[PDB]
Write a protein that binds this ligand. Structure first.
Ligand code: C1P
Ligand code: C1P
Ligand code: C1P
Ligand code: C1P
Lengths: 242, 234, 242, 231
């Protein structure tokens, strides 16, 4: 079910398109659905992967599609429900299970044990494949493909982040799954330099509710090319395709 | 602080531009920030006004700026916090107070009683003026000026709306404030509608939105939308 | 299905039991279940009535029972869902429908239109009857019968209440339904008469979440007798009976 | 500072009282306030210690008092806010800060950073001292003193518990603070633990953890640290 980026970007980027590397934000272009809250459950892998599919349907279909993380939690045998999972495993099971359910047909119950029951789903929403995004290609992928389901190495500082300029530690190993929804640049005073410097960042959608960070989001530092990774973002990185 | 529509539309509409009256949606074209939730507080006036400014900043500065409704609730002496307010009064106070704060500097605490404290804002974001939009000119104003802060007469049916073709009643008097973010047309008979962004969370309406019937000219109002109607200007 | 207060109190109040009119709080005696949130919906009548039943179950069966307001919203033909209803209508339909469902079998979706489907319920939880509480008997009924489903005249001040000593306006007419869960007394300095004065109060459980009032509760003034009504509480007042 | 158990219990256990080792539940006898929720913040140490003081005030003063965890998170210098703390440090600081605030005066906003401002409080609610409960005195201390603030070794299984007979793993080391609110039996003896992750965790916010009749068996290292505050 995996395609190669090399082939996919040829299809999605227009022939004569020039990438703007300074700023692009899918929140301004109808590509981002409301932030969700995983409550007390390690289902980040489901929120990341399903949210990336929500975004792809918004972009490609220009309408609001809200899907069920609970269905993956209950039915994705390749993953471990609230005990954790993988981005690739999740997309594989989206395909093999016959698609996602709407959020209203299959509502979220977090750590409450629930049997898998797809007979509760009326309509089903499939993806065709998914594509791994190379670490030197995040801005291009984000601009032409859409938001990216990414791993992140989250710390306690990240857990307790309530907005403002992030100065926290990163985790050792990737331990969380979030979504990249854009990039930007602002002028920020640089204390090791003693003046205003360009500060490039990726915009990350988390799944800990809109009371975490900045409306559920965080800006993490990158560079103009967008190769620099803060907290190991996108070590695993995939966009779902219709 | 109020400018005139005839002058403003001259500066903003390119010469020889022709208006597409069928459809135009600012969510697609960089002009709409996510939906917020006022919680158990009657601060709709703050959300409508501040949201129209977020939309202008997006359109003119090409990045997402999130501003503080709580600052207005707390510090807008011309309004009454959670007990209600007015669109014009809210824009006047944004000007008189020295501008908006960021959402992160001054976070939303709804009906929690809280004193004005502008010391906690670092950067500030002003508007120069605002313009009243004539009722016969909403599509023109949306397309060339941007999202409009509007009054609406909301009913119980409107409160309980969770998606689909709206066929509920209207309220008896303007009682709420929302934002017009575009217009569209579907074939249902052609059905022309305005796209309204509300401040009751993304689990109201359709992700926080409702389509309200108009006509091709866009003169027809459902729920007395835009009886009061203003775009803020930078 | 309405019983007679006079006959009911004689069965529930022990012989030689003497009422303590100072203080009694069912939250300190295992008779009150968690505060819930009706969200954007006029289903207070269902929160009031179901909550009082949760309380009777807790008191009489000494275990935790959490029931479904959504079932009444969906299925109570004598009420009007999010547009409102009545306490007695609610109890009448609990009986006619064949009992309440658990909260987990039939979760709350507020203003989302939902068909009545009692096949979703596995176990059902009935009541036998209900009794109207006279305005001169609230403390006696609270102590020996239990928490009372009551009407209240809620104003905008009441809506925006976030705790502390209540001094807002009351509404004109009853427009809301809450639960009386107890009564108390504290000594409060009068600014003013320069004397401590006894302040008697009822304890009201609301259904606007834990972030309203004092953990979802409000203390409203009464007198030692408990006859005095603040915000017309208990104009209509009922206890369900197992 | 701390008090001594043998002094405290002789004074609090009535002369010729006899311990019922089978069941005693403070939820029924006027000693437990509603379950709260720490949200996304490691302030369990504050919920535990404050909750035990809410419990003591309820038993001794016979009315429900709600106190401020946020005050301790913001103001306890010996602890590290959302990054964690200790049961003794918490009690020390409520003594040294001059008491707890009402929940109304100093409401909870979890991980949202706030500076300590005690000017927000009118009335203050002090404790006089607190006492450590020996390994072999949980049931006794429970019956005659009240709810105990305790440490617990909580696992992933524990975190994801939503009711029923608990058969999950225990944690490697104590990493959490709860309140013991009683004991019961159904063949099967247990302690009753009040948690601070909302009423939609466990059994309405509670978990029964296996013990024995004397109350010597400890599941999940409960009460490695074990204290009752005193008025
Ligand atoms: C989601 C991350 S979280 O729950 O939001 C979070 C947890 C801890 C620290 C910071 C954030 C889950 C947590 C899984 C978990 C971890 C510990 C106890 C219970 C549950 N993370 C994952 O699912 C990651 C995702 C990868 C993209 C890194 N996967 C994962 O941890 N595992 C994969 C399957 O085996 C379990 C381990
Ligand atoms: C916001 C709208 S709302 O809270 O979402 C709403 C309330 C009632 C019905 C429908 C929607 C506020 C509500 C103010 C209020 C009303 C009653 C009790 C408490 C609070 N509405 C306003 O602020 C309107 C906006 C205008 C542009 C129409 N203004 C308003 O009602 N007033 C102006 C100031 O004085 C009080 C009245
Ligand atoms: C619940 C009260 S509320 O929504 O929590 C509330 C009231 C006042 C201030 C703030 C919140 C419902 C609301 C019904 C409603 C009213 C207006 C518009 C939409 C919905 N109140 C009731 O159900 C009352 C309860 C009685 C015990 C007083 N009943 C009621 O309003 N009706 C009876 C049935 O017909 C409809 C009217
Ligand atoms: C509360 C426990 S918790 O956050 O509710 C929790 C535990 C297990 C599973 C899910 C939730 C805090 C956690 C503090 C913390 C730890 C790691 C990362 C972020 C925050 N635990 C404590 O405060 C314990 C209490 C003892 C009685 C065990 N103490 C503690 O962790 N520390 C002592 C003071 O310095 C920091 C470490």
């Amino acid at each position: 079910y995996e395609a190669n980026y090399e082939d996919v970007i040829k299809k999605y980027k227009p022939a004569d398109a020039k990438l703007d590397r300074i700023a692009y934000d899918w929140r301004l272009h109808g590509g981002v659905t409301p932030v969700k809250d995983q409550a007390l459950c390690g289902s980040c892998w489901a929120f990341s992967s399903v949210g990336s599919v929500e975004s792809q349907y918004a972009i490609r279909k220009k309408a609001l599609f809200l899907f069920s993380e609970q269905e993956l939690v209950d039915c994705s045998v390749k993953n471990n429900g609230c005990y954790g999972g993988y981005i690739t495993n999740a997309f594989d099971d989206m395909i093999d299970l016959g698609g996602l359910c709407s959020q209203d047909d299959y509502p979220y119950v977090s750590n409450l044990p629930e049997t898998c029951n797809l007979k509760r789903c009326n309509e089903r929403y499939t993806i065709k494949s998914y594509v791994s995004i190379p670490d030197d290609k995040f801005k291009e992928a984000l601009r032409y493909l859409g938001p990216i389901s990414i791993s992140i190495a989250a710390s306690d500082d990240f857990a307790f982040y309530r907005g403002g300029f992030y100065d926290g530690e990163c985790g050792a190993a990737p331990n969380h799954a979030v979504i990249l929804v854009g990039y930007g640049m602002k002028d920020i005073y640089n204390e090791d330099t003693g003046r205003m410097e360009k500060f490039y960042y990726y915009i990350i959608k988390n799944s800990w509710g809109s009371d975490w960070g900045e409306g559920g989001y965080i800006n993490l530092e990158t560079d103009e090319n967008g190769y620099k990774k803060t907290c190991s973002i996108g070590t695993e990185a995939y966009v779902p395709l219709l």
